[PDB]
Amino acid sequence: THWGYTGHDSPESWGNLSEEFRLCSTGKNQSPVNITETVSGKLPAIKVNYKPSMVDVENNGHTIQVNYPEGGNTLTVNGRTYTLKQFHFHVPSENQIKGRTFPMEAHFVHLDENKQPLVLAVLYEAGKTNGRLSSIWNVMPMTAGKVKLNQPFDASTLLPKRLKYYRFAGSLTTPPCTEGVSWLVLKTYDHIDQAQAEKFTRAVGSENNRPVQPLNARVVIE
């Protein structure tokens, strides 16, 4: 069923669109979130085993996304291996740091062998052109549609070397807003210039951030 970020269709009504999106309105563990208060703790280190792959770049109407047809690219956290399925973008950011919205956020979405979802997040500050995204921005379908990119894409360039993160449990920020999703929001910020963010918005047709949800019972670990 149709949903979006504006119109009579907007995030605050997602739960009533159908019975099967109801968690969007009724869940207590929803993403995204404003990360204000945190607990300093000893989080397991991330190990990135990303490498180049043959990807396609899809406009599904709601974001620009890079689909990984094969496993290949993994993340090991806490002796668990998670397989990168796809990554995609929000302009502006869904998650916030101390009330601060960022001009873009990237969501790297995974499953482990138990099919447990993990989202590793990168927040972009305004700054110089992102040279490592230009390859994806250049083939960006500006309407709904899908192109396989000729030259291999390496996602290791999209993650910093400093891999400190905020950790919390949450949900998909798009319908059906399924809960039980591990969130790891990296502290080290990448950058995008203004054209890049505007083009994206132009392509997808709107700013595509779900608004922040209450933490309720949850604690964010830094």
Ligand X SMILES: CC(=O)Nc1nnc(S(N)(=O)=O)s1
| Catalytic residue ranges | 62
Q: Binding of ligand X at residue 109 (CB under 6 A)?
A: yes
Nearer to ligand X, 79 or 83 (CB): 83
The vertex-193 CA angle with 86 and 101, nearest 5°, equals 70
Instruction: Give the HSE-up count for residue 8: Cα atoms under 13 Å, Cβ half-sphere.
Output: 0
The span from the CA of 111 to the CA of 117, in Å, is 5
Q: Which does 48 bind (CB under 5 to 8 A by kind): Zn ion, ligand X, none?
A: none
Q: Binding of ligand X at residue 104 (CB under 6 A)?
A: no
**Which positions make up the binding site for substrate?**
173-174
Sequence-distant (6+) residues with CB within 8 A of 28 are: 216, 217
Q: Binding of ligand X at residue 172 (CB under 6 A)?
A: yes
Nearest 10 degrees: CA dihedral of 207, 198, 167, 113? 90
Q: How many residues bind ligand X (CB under 6 A)?
A: 6
Q: Which does 96 bind (CB under 5 to 8 A by kind): ligand X, Zn ion, none?
A: none
From residue 63 to residue 102, the character string flagging contacts with ligand X as x (rule: CB under 6 A) and all else as - is ----------------------------------------
| Residue of 107, 166, 190, 203 that binds ligand X (CB under 6 A) | 107
Residue 109 tokens, joined: 């979405």
Compute the least distance from the CB of residue 40 to ligand X, in Å: 26
Q: Which does 119 bind (CB under 5 to 8 A by kind): ligand X, Zn ion, none?
A: ligand X
Q: Binding of ligand X at residue 119 (CB under 6 A)?
A: yes
Nearest 10 degrees: CA dihedral of 128, 130, 134, 137? -90
The span from the CA of 103 to the CA of 125, in Å, is 6
CB under 6 A: which stretch of 137-145, 155-163, 171-179, 190-198 binds ligand X? 171-179
Please confirm whether the linkage preceding 92 is cis (ω < 30° from 0): yes
